[PDB]
Amino acid sequence: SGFRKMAFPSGKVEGCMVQVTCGTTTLNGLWLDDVVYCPRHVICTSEDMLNPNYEDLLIRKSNHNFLVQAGNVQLRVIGHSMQNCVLKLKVDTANPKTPKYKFVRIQPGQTFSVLACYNGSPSGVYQCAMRPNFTIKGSFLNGSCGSVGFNIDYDCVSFCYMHHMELPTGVHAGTDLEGNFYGPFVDRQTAQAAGTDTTITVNVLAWLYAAVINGDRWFLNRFTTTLNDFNLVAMKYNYEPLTQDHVDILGPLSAQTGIAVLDMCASLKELLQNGMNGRTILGSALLEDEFTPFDVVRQCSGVT
Amino acid sequence: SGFRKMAFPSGKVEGCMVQVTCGTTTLNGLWLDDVVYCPRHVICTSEDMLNPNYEDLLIRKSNHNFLVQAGNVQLRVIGHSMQNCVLKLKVDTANPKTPKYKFVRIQPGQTFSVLACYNGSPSGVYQCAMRPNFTIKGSFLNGSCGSVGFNIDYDCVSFCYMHHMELPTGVHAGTDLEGNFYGPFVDRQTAQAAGTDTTITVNVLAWLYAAVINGDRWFLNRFTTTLNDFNLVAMKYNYEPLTQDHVDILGPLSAQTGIAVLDMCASLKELLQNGMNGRTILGSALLEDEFTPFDVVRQCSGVT
Ligand SMILES: Cc1cc(F)ccc1CS(N)(=O)=O
Numbered sequence: 001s002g003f004r005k006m007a008f009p010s011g012k013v014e015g016c017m018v019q020v021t022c023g024t025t026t027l028n029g030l031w032l033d034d035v036v037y038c039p040r041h042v043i044c045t046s047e048d049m050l051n052p053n054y055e056d057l058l059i060r061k062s063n064h065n066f067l068v069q070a071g072n073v074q075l076r077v078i079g080h081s082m083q084n085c086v087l088k089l090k091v092d093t094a095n096p097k098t099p100k101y102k103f104v105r106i107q108p109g110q111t112f113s114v115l116a117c118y119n120g121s122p123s124g125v126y127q128c129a130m131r132p133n134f135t136i137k138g139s140f141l142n143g144s145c146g147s148v149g150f151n152i153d154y155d156c157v158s159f160c161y162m163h164h165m166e167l168p169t170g171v172h173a174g175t176d177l178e179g180n181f182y183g184p185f186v187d188r189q190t191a192q193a194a195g196t197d198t199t200i201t202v203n204v205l206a207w208l209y210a211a212v213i214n215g216d217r218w219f220l221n222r223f224t225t226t227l228n229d230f231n232l233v234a235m236k237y238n239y240e241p242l243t244q245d246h247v248d249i250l251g252p253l254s255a256q257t258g259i260a261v262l263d264m265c266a267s268l269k270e271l272l273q274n275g276m277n278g279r280t281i282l283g284s285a286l287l288e289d290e291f292t293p294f295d296v297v298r299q300c301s302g303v304t
Numbered sequence: 305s306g307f308r309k310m311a312f313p314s315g316k317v318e319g320c321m322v323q324v325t326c327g328t329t330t331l332n333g334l335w336l337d338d339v340v341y342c343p344r345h346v347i348c349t350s351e352d353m354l355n356p357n358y359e360d361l362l363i364r365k366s367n368h369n370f371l372v373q374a375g376n377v378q379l380r381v382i383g384h385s386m387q388n389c390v391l392k393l394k395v396d397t398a399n400p401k402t403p404k405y406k407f408v409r410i411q412p413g414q415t416f417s418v419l420a421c422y423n424g425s426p427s428g429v430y431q432c433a434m435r436p437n438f439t440i441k442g443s444f445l446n447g448s449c450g451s452v453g454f455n456i457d458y459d460c461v462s463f464c465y466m467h468h469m470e471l472p473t474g475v476h477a478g479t480d481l482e483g484n485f486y487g488p489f490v491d492r493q494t495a496q497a498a499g500t501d502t503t504i505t506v507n508v509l510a511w512l513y514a515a516v517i518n519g520d521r522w523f524l525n526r527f528t529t530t531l532n533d534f535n536l537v538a539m540k541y542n543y544e545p546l547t548q549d550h551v552d553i554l555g556p557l558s559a560q561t562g563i564a565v566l567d568m569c570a571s572l573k574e575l576l577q578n579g580m581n582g583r584t585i586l587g588s589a590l591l592e593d594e595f596t597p598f599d600v601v602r603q604c605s606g607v608t
Pocket residue numbers: 004005006007008127291292294295296298299303427428429
């Protein structure tokens with residue numbers, strides 16, 4: 001019992017983190033097989049970052065300009081290419097600690113673990129969600145760029161995120177491992193405003209299921225509601241609309257707890273309308289939306 | 305920028321987790337050098353757990369009754385001894401992945417990372433604090449026992465916690481790696497009530513420093529206070545008394561932010577007296593006390 005915002009074990013990803021230096025810029029790279037993946041803005045001075053022409057900046061670069069360091073051993077770069085907003089440095093050595101892995105582009109509301117790194121060295125690991133405005137609320141200082149977000153499925157690491165930007169509002173933007181940004185963001189030091197950060201409704205409900213399971217029930221009410229009625233209330237409170245897909249995905253939690261999804265929606269409705277009244281659910285004074293339904297099933301069943 | 309409840313990277317500890325089976329009971333063990341550490345209640349049936357005589361139960365046990373499995377390879381047990389509430393199984397093979405390590409008994413209010421494991425397999429990693437009532441608020445299902453709490457100092461893993469018990473109130477009790485329980489708890493299925501879970505005042509203040517650093521300042525007031533005056537208010541709100549030691553430890557944050565410790569104490573006082581008024585600090589609607597001063601300095605400086 002007890003419920004915690006858990007990160008996946010980082011070991012398999014710790015083994016893939018290297019330091020990439022290009023001139024004076026040092027940031028993190030991901031070493032999988034004989035390729036090192038890193039943000040392409042490694043080639044930029046902070047002057048370049050105002051309006052960088054990456055194609056033009058990259059012409060000036062050679063394999064030997066990219067210094068890749070794995071622990072305290074240097075990797076020989078035998079090739080370099082730009083895929084969207086990431087650099088792929090082909091090294092002459094396959095990472096002997098390469099786990100089974102996939103590159104996956106996640107959807108907003110989906111959760112993953114970030115291994116925050118500096119100079120190819122892991123500092124800490126924390127659990128994130130892709131916000132519906134395609135930002136993440138990370139902890140990233142100078143040097144953290146190229147730190148990656150991942151999910152682990154038994155022994156296979158699905159890499160979903162590489163860190164690129166902090167927006168002027170102190171939220172974080174980045175790419176999948178094919179170097180395509182989440183949301184409308186570009187690797188340029190420019191006025192980039194994120195849209196409305198809406199609450200991930202399906203996640204809040206999953207977390208309310210997790211609460212009931214763990215004995216926090218005070219918020220369970222006598223009322224039910226409808227998808228349309230609930231969604232009127234969701235709209236007013238900047239909550240993502242709830243689909244039959246969301247209701248289907250919550251099925252097992254509904255089954256395990258014997259609380260219908262729409263009854264829990266009515267509980268959520270009252271919580272939105274009446275607040276917590278200074279009470280707490282699983283030791284939080286607001287509604288948590290960075291647990292997925294899959295996150296609760298797998299935590300409240302002990303999946304390794 | 306941005307502030308996150310980060311766990312240490314778990315890799316070095318993932319390498320030390322094994323499965324220990326004794327009869328029908330399976331739980332987690334820690335394999336360091338040629339010793340496997342695990343909870344001594346591995347030798348108990350859930351019948352034994354009501355009033356176990358561990359010395360008597362252990363007489364009946366031989367080296368070959370302890371089945372230690374590291375991944376999918378069996379370790380030969382050549383010796384077994386009881387140190388307090390842990391078993392030390394001497395195996396014939398040194399863990400080749402043994403990191404530099406120490407066993408340290410932590411003080412209440414001190415924070416550490418837990419690698420929650422099942423059948424010697426890591427499931428997730430999360431950051432904890434030793435509560436002032438010597439419990440932790442973990443996430444632990446059946447099989448999680450022998451999952452360990454640790455701090456990492458560069459490359460050295462300080463092991464501070466092994467998981468043993470969930471109390472009837474769903475909080476968690478355990479030992480240091482010498483098998484001495486934190487608090488008054490015993491490895492017995494009996495009415496064990498935890499005392500008052502007081503807030504770790506120094507940690508809340510450190511987190512308020514972290515807030516100011518990260519641009520959340522709304523709670524900064526015009527008032528200061530005294531250690532004695534603040535502590536009257538601390539007492540009323542089940543906050544740990546603040547010592548000159550706590551004030552000394554917050555020095556660097558006070559220095560970095562140019563907010564005197566006692567001024568921040570006055571900010572905390574108003575927050576205790578007036579609540580948040582439905583506002584949030586670093587995306588929390590209550591006062592976080594599971595970051596230490598050392599946790600903020602090292603997060604808001606990017607220590608690897
Ligand atoms: C331990 C774990 C494993 C997993 F596969 C999915 C989730 C979790 C828990 S959580 N929601 O804090 O990430």
